[PDB]
Design an enzyme around this catalytic site. Structure first.
Site, PDB file in Angstrom:
ATOM      1  N   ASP A 260       0.936  -1.221  -0.005  1.00 47.76           N
ATOM      2  CA  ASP A 260       0.070   0.115   0.086  1.00 47.76           C
ATOM      3  C   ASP A 260       0.765   1.056   0.082  1.00 47.76           C
ATOM      4  O   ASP A 260       2.196   0.981   0.143  1.00 47.76           O
ATOM      5  CB  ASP A 260      -1.130  -0.140   1.325  1.00 47.76           C
ATOM      6  CG  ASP A 260      -2.141   1.032   1.186  1.00 47.76           C
ATOM      7  OD1 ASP A 260      -2.271   1.564  -0.028  1.00 47.76           O
ATOM      8  OD2 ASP A 260      -2.834   1.095   2.065  1.00 47.76           O
TER       9      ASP A 260
HETATM   10 CL   LIG Z   1       0.545  -3.464   2.420  1.00 51.95          CL
END
Ligand SMILES: [Cl-]
Length: 299
Positions: free
Chosen positions: A62
């Site tokens: 992310d």
């Molecule tokens: Cl992640």
């Protein structure tokens, strides 16, 4: 040159990117693709449409998340000195650490180890301890951290430890092999420690929430009972620690093992990953600012 499938072991500091794969900032893959094109490993149109080189990544890390041991596979022209050439087109904070040719039938990345590097005042009792960076983690507070982290081990319903737009999925059983926190260390007055977790099929935000709940308990915002209660049916508003401190350490899978690369993995973590996290905590106070949000949670 001959076209071949290869697998790369790569590492990156995640600050300044919007993650590994494009869904704002460039991604890790943008840097890798540009390096592949510049070096001639792949033709331009395979950079434009990465599906055309059978590009695959093990972990969709992310925004802001680092990796010591990401793995990708793709088909390239296997040029001379390929590894050196790719790296020559990357910034210092992204490195190809290993590169192997595999059979076209090399298709496995759900089993993983991550670490989470954080300032120890994440563990300072809100009432009883100093909250600034002179906080030093006691043997006893570290015991407590380790006892609670240990509670995650095994198989549990982790439905409260993920997120989503839709309503909460009442069943999300997942397995954790290990979770603990190392002894702290100090860099210029700032004390940090490393949490490590090994598990399978981690869900979005799961590790960040696992760390977040234990921070909230240890700091004194929530009773220890919330951990067991969070396994229950009821929704619990579990705090989500920041992505900055998170590092994908290992992906555990024609077989494939990167044992000979462990020294380079370690060195890159020490030289590029950890200093950026520590630097950002020192200069931007990410953790300290997130901790100030803990009172908004209803426990
Ligand atoms: Cl992640």
């Amino acid at each position: 040159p001959p076209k071949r499938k290869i697998v790369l072991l790569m590492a990156y500091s995640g600050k300044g990117y919007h993650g590994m794969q494009r869904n704002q900032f460039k991604t890790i893959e943008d840097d890798l693709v540009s390096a592949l094109v510049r070096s001639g490993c792949i033709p331009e149109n395979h950079g434009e449409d990465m599906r055309k080189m059978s590009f695959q990544r093990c972990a969709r890390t992310d925004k802001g998340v680092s990796a010591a041991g990401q793995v990708v596979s793709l088909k390239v022209w296997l040029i001379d000195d390929i590894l050196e050439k790719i790296n020559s087109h990357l910034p210092s904070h992204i490195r190809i650490l290993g590169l192997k040719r595999v059979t076209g039938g090399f298709n496995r990345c759900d089993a993983r180890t991550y670490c989470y590097l954080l300032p120890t005042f994440a563990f300072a009792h809100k009432d009883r301890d100093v909250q600034d960076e002179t906080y030093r983690l006691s043997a006893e507070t570290l015991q407590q951290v380790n006892r609670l982290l240990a509670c995650y081990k095994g198989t549990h319903n982790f439905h409260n430890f993920t997120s989503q737009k839709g309503p909460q999925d009442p069943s999300a059983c997942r397995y954790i092999l290990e979770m603990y926190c190392e002894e702290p260390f100090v860099r210029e007055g700032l004390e940090f420690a490393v949490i490590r977790v090994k598990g399978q099929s981690f869900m979005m935000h799961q590790i960040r929430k696992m760390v977040g709940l234990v921070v909230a308990i240890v700091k004194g915002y929530a009773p220890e009972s919330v951990l067991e209660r969070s396994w229950g049916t009821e929704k619990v508003d579990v705090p989500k620690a920041p992505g900055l401190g998170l590092v994908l350490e290992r992906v555990h899978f024609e077989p494939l093992d990167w044992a000979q690369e462990e020294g380079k993995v370690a060195a890159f973590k020490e030289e590029h990953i950890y200093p950026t996290i520590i630097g950002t905590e020192r200069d931007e106070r990410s953790m300290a600012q997130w901790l100030s949000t803990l009172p908004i949670h209803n426990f």
